[PDB]
Amino acid sequence: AVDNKFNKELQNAVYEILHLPNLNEEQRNAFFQSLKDDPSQSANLLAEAKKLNDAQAP
Amino acid sequence: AVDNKFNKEFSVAGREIITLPNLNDPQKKAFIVSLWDDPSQSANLLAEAKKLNDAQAP
């Protein structure tokens, strides 16, 4: 029974999603909720947030 | 049981911390780790981060 906490991936994804300039507050909150619920998906969720950020570029 | 959700406090304090212009990268990352881990302490963490920012003004 390995204990995976996903510290590296989760902490990076939280920090990077806070940093993405083009997301609105509700979108950020949705990502944070997904991260809190399933840290194993942190890399996919960060990738999805980056795509959304880019699609909302000015 | 009461469910204290700190989604808004996290995003708001987190955005304020990550935008303080005089904090360095590891400082911001450390604050965000502490905030994610205990979001009930958002007010204290933001206050500490703001003081640090102001002590590092150019």
Numbering used by the authors:
A (entry chain A), B (entry chain B): 0 to 57
Show me the paper's own sentences about this structure.
The second library, LL2, used a more diverse codon set encoding mixed amino acids (F, I, L, V, H, K, N, Q, Y, D, and E) for four randomized positions on each of the Z domain and the affibody, so that the functional diversity (1.91 × 109) of the yeast library almost reached the theoretical nucleotide diversity (4.29 × 109). The highest affinity mutant from each library achieved approximately three-log enhanced affinity, KD of 1.99 nM for LL1.c1 (LIFFK/FILF) and 1.86 nM for LL2.c3 (LVLF/FIIV) compared to the original dimer (KD = 2.92 μM). For example, A-LILFK has more Z-B binding partners (B=77) than A-LIFFK (B=15) from the LL1 library, and A-LVLF (B=53) and A-VFLV (B=42) are also more cross-reactive than A-IVFF (B=3) from LL2 library sequence data. Binding of VFLV/IVVY and LVLF/FIIV are highly enthalpically favored and entropically disfavored, but by the end of the trajectory we see a more moderate enthalpy of binding coupled with a moderately disfavored entropy in IVFF/FILV. Although we could not observe any structural features that distinguish cross-reactive versus selective complexes, the thermodynamic properties of cross-reactive mutants (A-VFLV and A-LVLF) and specific mutant (A-IVFF) differed. We do not observe systematic differences in the structural parameters of the interfaces mediating specific (A-LIFFK in LL1 and A-IVFF in LL2) versus cross-reactive (A-LILFK in LL1 and A-VFLV, A-LVLF in LL2) complexes.
